[PDB]
Design a protein around this ligand. Structure first.
Ligand SMILES: CCCCCCCCC[C@@H]1NC[C@@H](O)[C@H](O)[C@H]1C(=O)O
Ligand SMILES: CCCCCCCCC[C@@H]1NC[C@@H](O)[C@H](O)[C@H]1C(=O)O
Lengths: 595, 583
């Protein structure tokens, strides 16, 4: 449907985000049968929302549990005559909500919010019970996809194809918000600029039988433009347009009035224009250079759960290190991260949860794009995730790119058949932004067959790590050669969205061999040397802020160790190399082929 | 503590600013939006939040600010602003009008803002937080200055001086007849529970249930309340609805209470007339990244670790914990020794200054008063909790200089008169043994901190066993009192191993915790053990702290050392609430 983030005005929120819900497992799938919605928690225990249920009890048998978990919470209802709505900003994978024995709504998104209108079903003044059924399972039509395997005892074991651990549960806000019966439930805003001198910001919104008078107030509450109608444009003059450095943000207050009731919604948008020209990524008609991380929503104890201290601290670290950009790696991030990126002018490459469409990253199906794995319904679900992501992050000026999928195996015939309609559909959904598909390493420029449909070429390369293990002299030649081959092929702006190596924070060696910090430094350094002599490399993005948790494997030593920082946010030796490089260059500009 | 039948203002981010030049109160920064502010998260200590070295140690004035919408549904009700905890000092302003202030730090403070607030429009909230300690703050300290005005704070406890807003901020609403004060005391012989009440223009009607609304008693009055006929295993707790009735509005307040009576008999600690044995940790309000800020995920996880390792009790070490810890504590029925921030009254703990600890320039007058205040507040907030079985006035004070007894006697007297239903204690330091301590008689349970084999007799088990044994049974023969060892632990690097089982290695933590447990087992007066710290925690910079205090069974990110499984074998291998029969 339509997605508007709620905000306090003559509108109200009761943060049911309160922790300490009742939590229980359903190892027998008796919950849907035995009507657990009715009343009690049976044999529950205290859990905390937001937060992943896997790491929260230090029980291994819970963290690998694959099935149905039950959340439970009684709450009181203060808003009368207002539309009361129950919003879940994120319930990872599947969630079915119940308000006092009655199914309200359900979702199969994972990292996208879903809400429901509960005005008839509640009465402001008495209690009410909310029971959530959260499913953490992945089959071939989920985004991301997976394979759940039962064995001889019927015990479910979830296997997937991405790297990060499949943290599940309620990860973001659960809120009970309250809006007048004539609401402003959808908005779209597109901005243009000409020579940083003047241009318009077209408006568009959806009401509940009310008219929309829209004003454009300033950063100090000064009206600069008005407008009367459901559509149309409106022009500023000599704007304070949104730059990657500062990030100026106008406050467009929209009004939807009825003959009796009225609703006012303030929506912050910044004037900026993002486009791709040849091999240049232009923000406000200036060629840009991306620097920063591909991070994860990962932490100790809470898993993929959200928390504010992590936001302010992580943004302080990136702010110190000189990073100006990041990419919401492998799933839509919490909207709060994108609000911060909006105010602080942080350019973001947004991505969907489509990751793992690849069976070469080592009882696996034998054809990746057959009916037994990634079929038409996988394509429908992928288009769904695109729809929801764009419908949530469409107005945020910090998003400059949509990324449909991550590292798909494109060698087999049919990858183009699967991905081309999704490129067409995404271009038809949001024309204001470039589109991309992050490229796997074993699909170099001479075997890929998908990168033509996208505006920006994103690359994940690990020459010298997975291949040429320990060889810098050779990985330099290979890396430079394939980079110039991508240039000779597509003449596109090339952002390296992943490049990193594993490093035991504390492992040193005089020989600068793999897994030591000296190898991380020398490796990133050589990669930077190659980066500086390719004209079409419009951005670099290291593989990963900090070490994150992965599934158990013989390649993951307590998870992925390719982070610049540790899981507790401590810098390895390479963090200060990146400090020197990024903070030493001119902001938003590519190095002049050398310092 | 609020319930209803509110809008939690601690949601999201606040504007944060520093006052290095100390211009805030003079230039009236609360009457405007903070110039040059940055986003900060509440709850959470401001020191660790920005990875800034200069912000972490800053000693002065910090400014929080946040606009909020007051809901329309609270038209004619009193609107109250509650700060569950603002560490050390806080002065709160509501939209150009000064409302409140408090020098507590680890206890809440609330203020009535009904006139200054018009429910429906947005108002701004500005908080001035101070993190300074002199000799009259609890805990005490002293600040020093030089040229360029750089302020540098020095204190006498171990843990790092985290500050800021550490617990939720509430904005609750009650009808014009509210239940401001409640008290409940439970008895049990081989019983019932007197009730209390304070209100304004309202009568008191008290009823109480069990599982769900199943009343099993009642009462109409501010006394008596006795009727029909809470354990450390599960923790059965009844629900006591209090009603305050007026001509127009009515108030209902639910208070969970568990039937229990704690008392000391000879050298036994009796909870419900049964001898007990304390096992568990002396923990801290410390975490990665957020300082002393509260968080539910951490409480759930740490309670999972304590449940797994077999702990049955712990002590809110060196300051009042967040009350959520105590609600959980009486829910799952874990025994809690509650303690004030009174720590650091000692000049002998020197890493290797006034001249006498109980002089006028240090610890005299307002110091004793404000200590009695920290008592009064801790008790006024945690009195009704059945999980609290003990009072702890102070921790590790130097009682050797002249005038210590003259200081500690009145505090014991007043505290005993305030809450006579629970035993009282004072954790004494190691440098004051049985032949030199002069205060352990004023208290019901004697608490001991002992580090034989670490600070003295460093690395020698064969003699530290003898010294610990002699000191222990000499205490027993001296005062014939119940002795809980509230601190015993040694530092340990998480990954350091050593074949020789020498200091700082995990083998030394294992073998050192073991000998202490045998000497514990051959002493009849030891009514419990609490390994020093649950998890490694942050302290001030010293040559004895290797990135904080490493005396934890778990690391800071909650990962177990070799001793965690030893203690999980010891505490769950014995019977719950029972001490081994000398083996
Ligand atoms: C057959 C040739 C294979 C080439 C190597 C492919 C490496 C893919 C790297 C992986 N790319 C995806 C990312 O989520 C992971 O964290 C990253 C990694 O594992 O470090
Ligand atoms: C004879 C006495 C020699 C010196 C003993 C010093 C004992 C001080 C105990 C200290 N008591 C306070 C506690 O927070 C600290 O963690 C603990 C410590 O040492 O780390």
């Amino acid at each position: 449907s339509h997605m508007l983030r709620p905000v306090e005005t003559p509108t109200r929120e009761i943060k049911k985000l309160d922790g300490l819900w009742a939590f229980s497992l359903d190892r027998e799938n008796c919950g849907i049968d035995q009507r657990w919605w009715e009343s009690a928690l049976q044999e529950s225990r205290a859990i905390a929302v937001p937060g992943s249920f896997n790491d929260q009890f230090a029980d291994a048998d819970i963290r690998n549990y694959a099935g149905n978990v039950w959340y439970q919470r009684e709450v009181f209802i203060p808003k009368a005559g207002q539309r009361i709505v129950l919003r879940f900003d994120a319930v990872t994978h599947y969630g079915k909500v119940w308000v006092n024995n009655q199914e309200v709504m359900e979702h199969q998104g994972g990292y996208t919010p879903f809400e429901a209108d509960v005005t008839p079903y509640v009465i402001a003044g008495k209690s009410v019970r909310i029971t959530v059924c959260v499913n953490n399972e992945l089959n071939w039509q989920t985004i991301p996809p997976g394979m759940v395997i039962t064995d001889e005892n019927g015990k479910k074991k979830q296997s997937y194809f991405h790297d990060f651990f499949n943290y599940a549960g309620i990860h973001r806000s659960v809120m009970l918000y309250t809006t007048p019966n004539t609401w402003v439930d959808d908005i779209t805003v597109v901005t243009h600029v000409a020579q940083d001198c003047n241009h318009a910001s077209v408006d568009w919104q959806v009401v509940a039988n009310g008219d929309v008078s829209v004003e454009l107030r300033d950063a100090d509450q000064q009206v600069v433009a008005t407008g009367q109608g459901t559509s149309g444009t409106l022009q500023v003059v000599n704007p304070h347009l949104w730059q990657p450095g500062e990030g100026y943000l106008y406050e467009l207050c929209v009004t939807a009035k009825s003959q009796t009731e009225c609703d006012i919604y303030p929506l912050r948008v910044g004037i900026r224009s993002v486009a791709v020209k040849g091999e240049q990524f232009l923000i406000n008609h200036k060629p840009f250079y991306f620097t920063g991380f591909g991070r994860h929503e990962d932490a100790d104890l809470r898993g993929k759960g959200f928390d504010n201290v992590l936001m302010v601290h992580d943004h302080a670290l990136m702010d110190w290190i000189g990073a100006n950009s990041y990419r919401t790696s492998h799933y839509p991030y919490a909207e709060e991260m994108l609000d911060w990126a909006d105010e602080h002018g942080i350019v973001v490459i947004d991505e969907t949860a489509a990751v793992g469409f690849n069976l070469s990253l080592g009882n696996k199906p034998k054809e990746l794009y057959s009916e037994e794995a990634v079929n038409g319904e996988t394509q429908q679900a992928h288009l769904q995730a695109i729809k929801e992501l764009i419908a949530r992050d469409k107005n945020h000026p910090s998003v400059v790119m949509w990324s449909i999928a991550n590292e798909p195996d494109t060698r087999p015939q049919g990858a183009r058949e699967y991905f081309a309609p999704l490129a067409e559909a995404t271009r038809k959904l949001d024309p204001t932004r470039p589109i991309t598909c992050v490229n796997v390493m074993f699909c170099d420029a001479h075997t890929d067959t998908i990168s033509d449909l996208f505006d920006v070429l994103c690359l994940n390369r690990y020459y010298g790590w997975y291949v040429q293990s320990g060889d810098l002299e050779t990985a330099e030649k290979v890396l430079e050669k394939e980079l110039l081959a991508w240039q000779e092929k597509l003449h596109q702006p090339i952002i390296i969205t992943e490049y990193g190596v594993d490093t035991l924070a504390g492992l040193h060696s005089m020989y600068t061999d793999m897994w030591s910090e000296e190898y991380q430094c020398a490796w990133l350094d050589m990669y930077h040397r190659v980066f500086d002599r390719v004209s079409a490399v419009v951005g670099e993005q290291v593989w990963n802020f900090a070490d994150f948790a992965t599934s158990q494997g013989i390649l993951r030593v307590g998870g992925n160790k390719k982070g610049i920082f540790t899981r507790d946010r401590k810098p390895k030796s390479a963090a200060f190399l990146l400090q020197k490089r990024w903070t030493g260059m001119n902001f938003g500009e590519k190095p002049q082929q050398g310092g």
